Amino acid sequence: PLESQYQVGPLLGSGGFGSVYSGIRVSDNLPVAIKHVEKDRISDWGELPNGTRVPMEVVLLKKVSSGFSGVIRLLDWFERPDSFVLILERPEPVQDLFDFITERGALQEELARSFFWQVLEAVRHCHNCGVLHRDIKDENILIDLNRGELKLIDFGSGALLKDTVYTDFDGTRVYSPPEWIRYHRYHGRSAAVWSLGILLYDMVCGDIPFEHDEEIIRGQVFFRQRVSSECQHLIRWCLALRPSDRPTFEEIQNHPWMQDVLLPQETAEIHLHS
Numbered sequence: 001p002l003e004s005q006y007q008v009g010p011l012l013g014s015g016g017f018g019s020v021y022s023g024i025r026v027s028d029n030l031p032v033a034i035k036h037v038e039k040d041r042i043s044d045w046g047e048l049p050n051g052t053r054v055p056m057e058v059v060l061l062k063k064v065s066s067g068f069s070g071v072i073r074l075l076d077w078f079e080r081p082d083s084f085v086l087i088l089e090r091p092e093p094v095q096d097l098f099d100f101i102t103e104r105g106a107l108q109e110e111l112a113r114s115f116f117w118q119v120l121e122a123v124r125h126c127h128n129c130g131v132l133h134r135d136i137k138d139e140n141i142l143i144d145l146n147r148g149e150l151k152l153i154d155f156g157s158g159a160l161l162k163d164t165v166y167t168d169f170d171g172t173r174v175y176s177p178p179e180w181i182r183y184h185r186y187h188g189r190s191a192a193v194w195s196l197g198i199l200l201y202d203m204v205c206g207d208i209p210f211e212h213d214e215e216i217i218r219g220q221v222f223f224r225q226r227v228s229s230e231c232q233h234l235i236r237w238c239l240a241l242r243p244s245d246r247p248t249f250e251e252i253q254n255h256p257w258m259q260d261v262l263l264p265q266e267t268a269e270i271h272l273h274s
């Protein structure tokens, strides 16, 4: 194989997700993202059916990359003496929902609904493939600004979906549910619904609802922008203090606020082009 079948461009960003660069597969000029992760900072390993000891990120990505989906797919990966290199796809042009929100503030409800729905679909896809992301938040969502398609990234805190209790979390705290904060115990679907509630508030209000543990535990959400009563109702339902009082994915997509979603292309024509 050997690594210079891609051409390396600018550093796109770096953080707990590793360092990610803009790249082009030389074979067919396909845009790509080259992620490097140091082996030293991988706490969670898995194995590939074949028998190789890989990072869990790569196991989870292989399971969800069957494609097509609203997940950025893993096209190839490589081992190095001190790091793994992952070759993922890259939309052009692209902006992460975090930067998009920093720039435009609270999103119009019709835009939030398209975006949230598409997130719901991607999260359904991961669950349907046996993958829990465990760090759903605006920084982990890419927008393809031409097609209006959202795409999920950075599965480094994810786990295989399981029906028993999780006692380990390494996601973002301010998107984590009260039962983790208080007891260090959660279940996959209900924690994911909670973070989908923090995301939905984030989109309609321009910011996350809670910063502090005490605020999460209390679960009382104040609205700082004018948000519709139906949208407020769905947000508060995802943010219920008791996991069992949170909605299923089906109940979210059957909520009256989620009816008449725009299709991605209309979404980009109306809210994203020019």
Ligand SMILES: CN(C)CCNc1ccn2ncc(-c3cn[nH]c3)c2n1
Pocket (backbone or CB within 6 Å): 012, 013, 014, 017, 020, 032, 033, 035, 072, 088, 089, 090, 091, 094, 096, 139, 140, 142, 153, 154
């Ligand atoms: C979290 N945030 C700093 C995003 C970093 N900027 C970018 C820009 C474009 N792409 N295109 C694919 C990716 C990708 C990131 N991880 N896996 C794929 C990517 N990241």
